[PDB]
Swiss-Prot record, chains A, B:
Enzyme Commission number(s) of this protein: 3.6.1.-
Membrane topology classification: Single-pass membrane protein
Protein name according to UniProt: Mitochondrial chaperone BCS1
Binding positions (ATP): G182, P183, P184, G185, C186, G187, K188, S189
Protein species of origin: Mus musculus
């Protein structure tokens, strides 16, 4: 008779979600307490009732079905670092089309739960797991970069995603990589978040300086990356000097051969972020691994004008021009974050913002 | 009565494949979720239904057969680092020819699944395992090397494979090795992939700087390498200085005696790749271990001409000559990867490619 055993690998989440959502008559429940991010930032705790071992029964269209958890917890391993957490579906039939159907429905509901939000994955051992809960999509119009830099990057990445046949009919690998660099507090990580929210993509964070990251495990992680997901390497310069400086068993050649080597996977987009670009070996930022280097730097006239128009909507452009001129006359280099803080002091008080410029001259 | 116990060693894969393919009436299934690389790069997730413990039955020609998995998971070891994963075939006969027949059929189907693709193996402990899924065979006409370098290597390796009797009638060992060296971004790994795809061979990656690689384990791995497979050592210079610099318990003499020693195996082809050749000890690149050193270097006139003809098919040769002349006049040394990126900017716009050459002068 029909029987299915998920095995707890890159599928467990979706089936748990469906189990909770559809049944509504189940017993042997549990308590999963977590945070929920309501509108207006006022978080509140929330309970999800999820299975616990013993026999659970569900009536979905057609025949009765018996689902179950078989957690005979012998877990001497890091493969889960928790009980093995099997699951079981079964039913008194021998036409296994309906089981395939229910699982695909679970996939559909899972991918539909995140409609206007941004998932963040993370590395658990050598697999990708959800991390926390869906975040709020930071709009892309609220990250003011230099004149004609966000449009360039967005256009290039869109062109990359909507021309896969041009890469195959010439034998090139279907990969790409980007590198944002510049001083501290200038718009790298925020732009990455906004870009991920504009392309309906997700994010997958990867911390090289981590105690459980061998070259083989890294080569396996980037190959099993979720579909339609940006991978991200934050501060890749702090990992190497052509010599490792972190806790772990990762080398330089392993990284260089995992990004672009002989057994690298297709349809992958990697971002890197660094503050200092002189400490990066030229064998890691050459074309093939990193096809677009961009410098997100200190503010200029246009940036300050646009930031002023963002914070105080409903003012004449003359006031914004006055602000930009005064600030850029006062101090030579000023990052957008300092300007953000300065506006954070004067909420809904544009005149006071234009009057108290002299507090920025360090 | 007839009974067989695979023992989970260099055979498990093929029997699992046959179990899935032929039965179609099995129960106690499972869920193996993975990626599938359709045409046009648009990957999609995919499910394979594979066995799970309990009794499975199959009707293959002749007599009924009872197959089974006996996973009584006690796994305190790295020999599998997972449950022991036995398998069992059995049948009410005493003529053990048919079992041999079914296993050979499984081997046939397994070797036939990969028809126009390239397998990549990897090192799991001290055995070779499949890694991911079959890749797409990069054509050899899309890797433009110097004038008469790919033909030379391909001809030498073909002559090696099609004259095994000349090596035995003179007592020489039936081994060979190659070494590609040169600057970064000049065509080493890509050429290795193309060459493996042209000879219907496979690839077996080996990372020396790995935490679980003793000299004995290495001597055992290269002896149990799959049939018709290139072995590959990427960045062999970063492992030694005549002193180890990696995580592991590997030495120099162990490597030198594993490649060519007293207990080295026959019918083996090894590739090495390095950027710096001066840091290699002359006792590792002398003849016997490495019989052909080649320098894949910066571009020249002919390379640029051929690359232009590859990217923009259907243009007059005059335009390609103009491009090559202008680029080689602009900058002294330019690698093929920079040229690839420059063409990646101007898609299907040859005139713009010939006009915007000056953007390469650094
Ligand atoms: N162009 C910009 N427009 C709006 N806010 C910006 C801009 N650039 C930076 N910021 C502000 O910078 C803050 C954080 O930006 P980040 O991208 O994290 O800076 P950063 O480069 O990561 O600095 P480090 O090195 O990580 S401490 C946020 O509060 C943003 O509001
Ligand atoms: N002769 C060539 N023809 C076409 N593409 C080439 C050629 N040489 C290099 N490339 C490009 O180089 C890229 C990677 O080639 P690789 O062989 O990996 O370079 P590499 O020598 O491995 O550099 P490192 O040291 O590993 S960063 C691919 O995108 C190729 O298109
Ligand atoms: Mg940051
Ligand atoms: Mg390489």
């Amino acid at each position: 008779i029909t029987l299915e055993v998920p095995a707890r690998d890159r599928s467990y989440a979706w089936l748990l979600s469906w189990l909770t959502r559809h049944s509504t008559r189940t017993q042997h429940l549990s308590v999963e307490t977590s945070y929920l991010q309501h509108e207006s930032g006022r978080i509140s705790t929330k309970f999800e009732f999820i299975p616990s071992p013993g026999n659970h029964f569900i009536w979905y269209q057609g025949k009765w079905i018996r689902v179950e958890r078989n957690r005979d917890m012998q877990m001497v391993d890091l493969q889960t670092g928790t009980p093995w957490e099997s699951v079981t579906f079964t039913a008194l039939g021998t036409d296994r089309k309906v089981f395939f159907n229910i699982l695909e429905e679970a996939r559909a509901l899972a991918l539909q739960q995140e409609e206007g939000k941004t998932v963040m994955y993370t590395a658990v051992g050598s697999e990708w797991r959800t991390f926390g809960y869906p975040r709020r999509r930071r709009p892309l119009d609220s990250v003011v970069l230099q004149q004609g830099l966000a449009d360039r990057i967005v256009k290039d990445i869109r062109e990359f995603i909507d021309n896969p046949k041009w890469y195959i009919d010439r034998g090139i690998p279907y990969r790409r990589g980007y590198l944002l660099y510049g001083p501290p507090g200038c718009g790298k990580s925020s732009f990455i978040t906004a870009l991920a929210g504009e392309l309906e993509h997700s994010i997958c964070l990867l911390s090289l300086t981590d105690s459980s990251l061998s070259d083989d495990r890294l080569n396996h992680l980037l190959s099993v990356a979720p579909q339609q997901s940006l991978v991200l390497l934050e501060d890749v310069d702090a990992a190497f000097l052509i010599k490792y400086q972190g806790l772990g068993r990762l080398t330089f050649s392993g990284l260089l051969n995992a990004l672009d080597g002989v057994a690298s996977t297709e349809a992958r987009i990697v971002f890197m972020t660094t503050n200092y670009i002189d400490r990066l070996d030229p064998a890691l930022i050459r074309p093939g691994r990193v096809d677009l280097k961009e410098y997100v730097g200190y503010c200029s006239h246009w940036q300050l004008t646009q930031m002023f128009q963002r914070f105080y909507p409903g003012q004449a452009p003359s006031l914004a021009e006055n602000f930009a001129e005064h600030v850029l006359k006062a101090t030579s280099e000023i990052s957008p974050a300092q300007v953000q803080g300065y506006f954070m002091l004067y909420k809904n008080d544009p005149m006071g913002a234009v009057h108290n410029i002299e507090s920025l001259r360090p």
